[PDB]
Amino acid sequence: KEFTEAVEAKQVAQQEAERARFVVEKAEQQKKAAIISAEGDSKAAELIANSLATAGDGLIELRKLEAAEDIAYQLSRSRNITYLPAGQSVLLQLPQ
């Protein structure tokens, strides 16, 4: 069963090797696309970085406060979310 399968694998692998030279080309193009989309996200991010670096940590904390509303909004669609103060000696003991 491995003889015909090996021959077809060699043929399909030559087809896929040429198709995959062109798929490495496609991958350069698709990476232009994915880079630029993940960088939709992340260039929004870098302009946020510039805003917070020039202006200071204003919305560093205030999306750490506005989006901190997300904590109370969204923590316990489950049932066991919580926290524990620091600068201290907490006896952490997760719930059951």
Partner: protein
Amino acid sequence: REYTAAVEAKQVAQQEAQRAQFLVEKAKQEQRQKIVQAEGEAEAAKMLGEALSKNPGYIKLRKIRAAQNISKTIATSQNRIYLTADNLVLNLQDESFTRGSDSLIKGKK
């Protein structure tokens, strides 16, 4: 199956590399769309820095209001988050009452 698939995929790959440059354009557009989602976020950012890096005043007040809003939606939150003893001081009689309420003192804040 993978042979015809591979050859058709190579031809479709030429036409789809053309359409992939088209995708680079379309994804520069999505670039702008998410740029701008987080750049409304970033307008908030640039101004909140310019108004708070001086001294975090709305950031003091928005730790307070985000603690209040975090409480406020902790209401609907089943979360077994808590608080604990002695800051919102409801040791209503205490020095710590004048170290949570007089903690409002600047320098202690």
